[PDB]
Ligand binder design. Sequence first.
Ligand code: HEM
Length: 291
Amino acid sequence: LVHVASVEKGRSYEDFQKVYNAIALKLREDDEYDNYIGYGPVLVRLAWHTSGTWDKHDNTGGSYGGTYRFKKEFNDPSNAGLQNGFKFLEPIHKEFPWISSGDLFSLGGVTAVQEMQGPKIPWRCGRVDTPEDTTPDNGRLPDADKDADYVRTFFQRLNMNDREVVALMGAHALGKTHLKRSGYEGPWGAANNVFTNEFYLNLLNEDWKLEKNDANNEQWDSKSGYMMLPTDYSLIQDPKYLSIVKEYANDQDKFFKDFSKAFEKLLENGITFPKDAPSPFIFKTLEEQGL
Ligand code: HEM
């Protein structure tokens, strides 16, 4: 099945910059969430999980249809906690009812990365809501208790190569694991609502110990109070991933550029953009606008 991008009727860059801005202003205002981490990280994860159900083999799942709004997908165990990002976006959608669900979930992620001082992420409009029976089944998002071979094979289904995988994983600088959500507990670093290459630096430079958490799952822990999932740690166990981790730990600009490309790609998988579609939009941050 082909999913052709269809611009919300009559809308242009300024309309979407207004949606961006409303997201960004609420991110600033609603600062208490998650012990003052704020909503940035969970909005990035919402964008990824709503895109990451895609299957390149038959074009099922993906960001286009905004199917997270249906109960089979919002109740996926893999999505536990993302309801907080959805609730955040509800007043945004009420103010701007013309935006599609897929466009809003993906734009939330872009806006969060940029407002957290991350790279610019070009973003295209035109996702169209599809019906409840197009919702992908549970089980397409990845397990955390696995090794590098698992990670590499998993991401082939999303058409991501080694560099794209290691770059995307750098988003684990953000937010934290929550025991009641995923069976893992703790942040990956100190700067968890500012977008930096800290994930790679901590992988290489902390002294990690393999411990069991209070849900009886293994995770890697440091004396600084940081953690890594087994799938994170696999990036320094596999020699191909290790090389790339070292590259990003040593070049913040390269990480930013490669993350931006991979994240846009993730958010666009499955979508056909007509030859005469608008060019991708690059939104200004609140700071750049003086707001
Ligand atoms: C092998 C792939 C991956 C696995 C197994 C994985 C697993 C996890 C787990 C278990 C959590 C903690 C959930 C919780 O307890 O709240 C988490 C959080 C998160 N993940 Fe991933 N992840 C992967 C890839 C990614 C990618 C590709 C991105 C986005 C580019 C991403 C962004 C995030 C963010 C931002 C959080 C923090 C959420 C919060 O603080 O609420 N992850 N991930």
